[PDB]
Structure 1
Amino acid sequence: KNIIIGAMTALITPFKNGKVDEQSYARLIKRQIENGIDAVVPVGTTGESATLTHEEHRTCIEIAVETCKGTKVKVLAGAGSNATHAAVGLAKFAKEHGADGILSVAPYYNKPTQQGLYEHYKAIAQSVDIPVLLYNVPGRTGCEISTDTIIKLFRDCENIYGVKEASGNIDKCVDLLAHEPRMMLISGEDAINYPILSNGGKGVISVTSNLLPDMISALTHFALDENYKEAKKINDELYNINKILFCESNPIPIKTAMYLAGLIESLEFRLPLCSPSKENFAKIEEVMKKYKIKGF
Structure 2
Amino acid sequence: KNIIIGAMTALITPFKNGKVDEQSYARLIKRQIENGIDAVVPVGTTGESATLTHEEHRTCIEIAVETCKGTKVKVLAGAGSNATHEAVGLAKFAKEHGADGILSVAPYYNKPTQQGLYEHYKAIAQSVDIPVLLYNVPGRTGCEISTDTIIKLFRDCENIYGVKEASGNIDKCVDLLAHEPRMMLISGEDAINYPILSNGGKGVISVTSNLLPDMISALTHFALDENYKEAKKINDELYNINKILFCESNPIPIKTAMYLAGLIESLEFRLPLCSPSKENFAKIEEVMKKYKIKGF
TM-score range relative to shorter protein:
over 0.9
TM-score (norm 1): 1.00
The equivalent of 2:105 in structure 1 is 105
The equivalent of 1:25 in structure 2 is 25
SS at match of 1:226: coil
What do the CA deviations read for 1:174-196 (whole angstroms, capped 9, x no partner)?
00000000000000000000000
Question: Aligned-pair distance for 1:84?
Answer: 0.1
Structure 2: distance between partners of 1:286 and 1:111: 39
Question: Aligned-pair distance for 1:214?
Answer: 0.2
Structure 1: distance between partners of 2:65 and 2:159: 20
What do the CA deviations read for 1:268-296 (whole angstroms, capped 9, x no partner)?
00000000000000000000000000000
What do the CA deviations read for 1:35-94 (whole angstroms, capped 9, x no partner)?
000000000000000000000000000000000000000000000000000000000000
SS at match of 1:162: strand
Structure 2: distance between partners of 1:206 and 1:167: 14
What do the CA deviations read for 1:221-244 (whole angstroms, capped 9, x no partner)?
000000000000000000000000
Question: Aligned-pair distance for 1:30?
Answer: 0.3
1:71-86 correspondence to structure 2 within 5 Å: 71-86=71-86
Question: Aligned-pair distance for 1:204?
Answer: 0.1
SS at match of 1:40: strand
Q: Which runs of 4+ in 1 moved over 2 A?
A: none
1:181-260 correspondence to structure 2 within 5 Å: 181-260=181-260
1:1-296 correspondence to structure 2 within 5 Å: 1-296=1-296
Structure 2: distance between partners of 1:218 and 1:124: 33
CA RMSD of aligned residues (A): 0.2
Structure 2: distance between partners of 1:256 and 1:175: 36
Structure 2: distance between partners of 1:20 and 1:159: 31
In structure 2, the gaps of 5 or more residues are none
Structure 2: distance between partners of 1:190 and 1:290: 17
What do the CA deviations read for 1:136-193 (whole angstroms, capped 9, x no partner)?
0000000000000000000000110000000000000000000000000000000000
SS at match of 1:61: helix
SS at match of 1:109: coil
Question: Aligned-pair distance for 1:8?
Answer: 0.2
Structure 2: distance between partners of 1:19 and 1:131: 30
Structure 2: distance between partners of 1:201 and 1:288: 28
What do the CA deviations read for 1:181-216 (whole angstroms, capped 9, x no partner)?
000000000000000000000000000000000000
Structure 1: distance between partners of 2:228 and 2:258: 29
Question: Aligned-pair distance for 1:121?
Answer: 0.1
Structure 1: distance between partners of 2:262 and 2:91: 34
SS at match of 2:61: helix
SS at match of 1:46: helix
SS at match of 1:107: coil
SS at match of 2:45: coil
What do the CA deviations read for 1:246-265 (whole angstroms, capped 9, x no partner)?
00000000000000000001
SS at match of 1:134: strand
TM-score (norm 2): 1.00
Question: Aligned-pair distance for 1:5?
Answer: 0.1
Question: Aligned-pair distance for 1:3?
Answer: 0.4
Structure 2: distance between partners of 1:65 and 1:93: 13
